Amino acid sequence: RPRFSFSIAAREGKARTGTIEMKRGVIRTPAFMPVGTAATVKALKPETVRATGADIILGNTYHLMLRPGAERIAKLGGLHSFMGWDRPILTDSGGFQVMQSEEGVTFKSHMLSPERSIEIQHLLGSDIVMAFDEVTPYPATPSRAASSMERSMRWAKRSRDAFDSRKEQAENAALFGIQQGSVFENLRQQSADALAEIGFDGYAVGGLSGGEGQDEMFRVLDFSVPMLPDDKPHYLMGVGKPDDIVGAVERGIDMFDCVLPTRSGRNGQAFTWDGPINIRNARFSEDLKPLDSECHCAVCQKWSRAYIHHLIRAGEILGAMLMTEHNIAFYQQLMQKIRDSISEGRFSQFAQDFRARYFA
Amino acid sequence: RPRFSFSIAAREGKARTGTIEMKRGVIRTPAFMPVGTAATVKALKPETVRATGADIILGNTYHLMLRPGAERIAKLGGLHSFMGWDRPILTDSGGFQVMQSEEGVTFKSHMLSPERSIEIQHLLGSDIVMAFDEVTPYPATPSRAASSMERSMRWAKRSRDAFDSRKEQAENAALFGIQQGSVFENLRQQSADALAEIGFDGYAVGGLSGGEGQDEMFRVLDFSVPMLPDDKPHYLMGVGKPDDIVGAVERGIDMFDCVLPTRSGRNGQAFTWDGPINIRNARFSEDLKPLDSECHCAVCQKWSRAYIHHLIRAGEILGAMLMTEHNIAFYQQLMQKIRDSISEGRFSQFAQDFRARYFA
Numbered sequence A, B: 001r002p003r004f005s006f007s008i009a010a011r012e013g014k015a016r017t018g019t020i021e022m023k024r025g026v027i028r029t030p031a032f033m034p035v036g037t038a039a040t041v042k043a044l045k046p047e048t049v050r051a052t053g054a055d056i057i058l059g060n061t062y063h064l065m066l067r068p069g070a071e072r073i074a075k076l077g078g079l080h081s082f083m084g085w086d087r088p089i090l091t092d093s094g095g096f097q098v099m100q101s102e103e104g105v106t107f108k109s110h111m112l113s114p115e116r117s118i119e120i121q122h123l124l125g126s127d128i129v130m131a132f133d134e135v136t137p138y139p140a141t142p143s144r145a146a147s148s149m150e151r152s153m154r155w156a157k158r159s160r161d162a163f164d165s166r167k168e169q170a171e172n173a174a175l176f177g178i179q180q181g182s183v184f185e186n187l188r189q190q191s192a193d194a195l196a197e198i199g200f201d202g203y204a205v206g207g208l209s210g211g212e213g214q215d216e217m218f219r220v221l222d223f224s225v226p227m228l229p230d231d232k233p234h235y236l237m238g239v240g241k242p243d244d245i246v247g248a249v250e251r252g253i254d255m256f257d258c259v260l261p262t263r264s265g266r267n268g269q270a271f272t273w274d275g276p277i278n279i280r281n282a283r284f285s286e287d288l289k290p291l292d293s294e295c296h297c298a299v300c301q302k303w304s305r306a307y308i309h310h311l312i313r314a315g316e317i318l319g320a321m322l323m324t325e326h327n328i329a330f331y332q333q334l335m336q337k338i339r340d341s342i343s344e345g346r347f348s349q350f351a352q353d354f355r356a357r358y359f360a
């Protein structure tokens, strides 16, 4: 396998399905990345993450640099070895957790800058490295959005140069740039233009899911995604709810990460094709059905709603484990249905059918 | 398989190795039972419990009756179905958690008595049912020890009769009686005599590990175990540390349960053949070795001390999972080495070698 190759196998409107080939494996797009905060997808062994269908997971640069430490992980062999996940890993850059000077930022639990962020991602042994950016809070005035976007584009060039100057990283990993500009079309365009002039392996749409709500997010995606190079992956960071994913794919997004399936699983929320359920609710106390009637996951093959209800109410670790496994499996099944429907030219109908039942 | 059959395959001194055949499976003795408090061996799926070598697990009557409820579990199909463990389950009776009238006891989180305890164990679908007893606090005066023992023997007969009057339970489960009498040889003998006159499928030594310490516990086992019927299993409830298990087997015990491997795993203590380690200690922060150098468990095949150190310090659920799996696997490997050494007539040497290295 090459360092990086993205191929589109089929299209429907703005939606695409295809593959990213990297040295540690192939990633089927559109892809959902389970989030490994501190070198673990919470409550799951890596084999279990893989069994659900995940091709790639996300690691958080900010958190890993605080504990256990980036240099410590490198000394121990890198993140893949440390946590026992041998497939691709994408690492975010830290600009979200940060949300200061033109050089970068210092904070108390440390320093982050374009150079230091790329270096930490190198120390971890990341396959997909994200450029270090400045993330504008929503809402943002035009002036502030422009200033943060301009800074982010200067930092994208510094990110690019830091990555390239590290031969081992440049030869074996990929680097993605991050579009900014808040909700403003002209800034989004300036940003896209700047990123494409520098050139990246992939392009994230940054700055959304920051409080603007789905309508506004979709409106911004409507004009922002066509500004990115068509022949590279489009990554929407920190999204999201199933309906957010479907609608973002309808608008050209190829990759996703979110803590929702994991976090909400631990809290008692299970995803189903008829919408999420609150497993702690009394209505589930003697319900022998699985979490979801169609789900192929091991949890739904083996345990009832009633049992998982008990586990979560009791604070048992196995409750977290089962909820999380199901939720991640559900998310992967969603992505698989999206991939198959696009390849078969029936994604429009899938989205319609999905929504009518999920929000019945 | 029969309802119940215990066969001794080999002996060395007072130590025995053999099998208990029951309808849901065979139990290799000497046996360690992982404890499932509230319908879960904490942090482990039942398949993982089985993969470690466990033949049987313990369920806590007291806790299950409080949450989720005994009648609720019966309505849902019984404990095996509820939690997804299809092999034998032993349930304790509640007399430990209780530690009042001659009829039984009422308390606030409910009622327990010989009849109600046997009924709850029936509702759960237990394979090995324990008689309901009264457990004397240590230390106990001779007079108090005698009174509690006498009461326990009256309650053993009531337990026996309740079990027998329930045809389904009598035909498919086994009933074990519990010897009491504190540290007093004459009371222990009276108790053994009373239990054997009633007749049970197995005999537990109750009332120990209550603060008397290992020396005293071993002294009491020295005279108490020979009082029990030789041809039935001998169960030491709530024991224990590896060296406690070895010494109890040297004195004729065939079965064990304890929360130590699970509880102490979650807290950061890993068992090793050179003794327990505190994985949170700084000395493990960059240690690439497995938890134990010889352990065959999946955790030690795959992850380092350093990683598990990180997980436990971070409060991650996977830390609990890995620690627990290892500790239960260690305990099963201990039991396997005990079984093999007795069968091969080299258990004396094993015990000696085990102790010299574990306490080096």
Ligand SMILES: NCc1c[nH]c2nc(N)[nH]c(=O)c12
Pocket (backbone or CB within 6 Å): A092, A093, A094, A095, A096, A130, A131, A132, A133, A135, A178, A205, A206, A207, A208, A209, A210, A237, A238, A239
């Ligand atoms: N949801 C927006 C977002 C999530 N994670 C992010 N990480 C970075 N560097 N930048 C961003 O804009 C975002």
Ligand SMILES: NCc1c[nH]c2nc(N)[nH]c(=O)c12
Pocket (backbone or CB within 6 Å): B092, B093, B094, B095, B096, B130, B131, B132, B133, B135, B178, B205, B206, B207, B208, B209, B210, B237, B238, B239
């Ligand atoms: N360690 C003593 C002990 C543990 N669990 C027990 N359960 C019962 N019924 N009786 C007992 O004496 C004990």
Ligand SMILES: [Zn+2]
Pocket (backbone or CB within 6 Å): A291, A292, A295, A296, A297, A298, A299, A300, A301, A326, A327, A329, A330
């Ligand atoms: Zn499922």
Ligand SMILES: [Zn+2]
Pocket (backbone or CB within 6 Å): B291, B292, B295, B296, B297, B298, B299, B300, B301, B326, B327, B329, B330
């Ligand atoms: Zn191990």
